[PDB]
Design a protein around this nucleic acid. Structure first.
Ligand SMILES: [Ca+2]
Ligand SMILES: [Ca+2]
Ligand SMILES: [Ca+2]
Lengths: 161, 161
DNA sequence: GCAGGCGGTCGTGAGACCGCTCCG
DNA sequence: CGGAGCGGTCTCACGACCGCCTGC
């Protein structure tokens, strides 16, 4: 497993060249709610320093997927899923500074995901944190995400409340 | 002073949003050798996250100078001088990965600076590491720095060897 | 149906510096 | 002097995502 100063480093580095986000991805094939909430952390870097993502990956139990080239010389390492994340984040949260919040919102989403799954009213609360999160990843002067307001609208238009 | 996982974090973060460089700055006012070698580490970031540089600064004994805005909304924190650096780097070196080398070259320059000061032959060795350093901070496909070769040339042209 | 493996991509936010002004 | 405070700037290297193909 992970040592304090390796967790601290990864956290330090994540605050630098990394990213903690949530997404609301449309689903045509889904049931009632045609949207899967997607969660991840990532590390971006110039492919020549790839062995350094490499390193990190291996330090994080080989969860997530490395990508020696995103097609533009820039390499990366993306960790999807509440599974990987609920193991990883707690180790990193105590050392995160800039993206610490984001990491807790994600954990928070993770607590409420099972009850919100088949429950349109609760899936909306969940989608709000998804908004708040992507907001955290913004300039205070950029357009503030609005998945909560466009999903509700649609849930009413479809008589799900 | 500095704790392991705070040093680890700073190192992690430096490897991300920071920079370790050496420069050869021209001096019209100098004596024989009209060039001062300049050494530093820095942390760059969007000014809204400034309190986070802040943090780091204070964790690094308030050495170096913060800059809430470089004129382009981007804030920073620059630490010049062998003085600050010979105290700081050793705490960070054990946790540095990507810029670890650079940190040791700097330390290395720091060992040889006093003898190379008034000694054109030795000042050249020193200026080579200065080259190697800025090379480390490059794409393997970029033009490889050449302070060693343009300073020598000039030292001969001026009969200093 | 349930999601994660992937491929992609605009828009900045960093990096790695150069030159001056200043100060014991 | 001998260097460090400070302003300033090109060129990318990131970030924070979208949309689709893949697995069972
Ligand atoms: Ca950053
Ligand atoms: Ca960065
Ligand atoms: Ca970086």
């Amino acid at each position: 497993t992970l040592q304090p100063t390796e967790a601290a480093y990864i956290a330090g580095f994540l605050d630098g060249d990394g990213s903690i986000y949530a997404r609301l991805e449309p689903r045509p094939d889904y049931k009632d709610i045609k949207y899967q909430v997607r969660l991840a952390i990532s590390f971006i870097q110039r492919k020549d320093k790839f062995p350094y993502l490499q390193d990190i990956y291996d330090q994080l139990g080989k969860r997530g997927i490395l990508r020696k080239d995103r097609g533009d010389g820039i390499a990366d390492y993306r960790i999807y899923g509440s599974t990987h994340l609920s193991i990883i984040l707690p180790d990193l949260v105590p050392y995160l500074r800039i993206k610490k919040k984001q990491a807790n919102r994600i954990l928070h989403i993770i607590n409420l995901y099972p009850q919100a799954q088949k429950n349109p009213s609760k899936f909306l609360d969940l989608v709000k944190i998804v908004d708040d999160v992507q907001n955290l990843n913004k300039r205070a002067d950029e357009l503030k995400s609005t998945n909560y307001d466009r999903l509700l609208e649609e849930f009413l238009k479809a008589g799900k409340i």
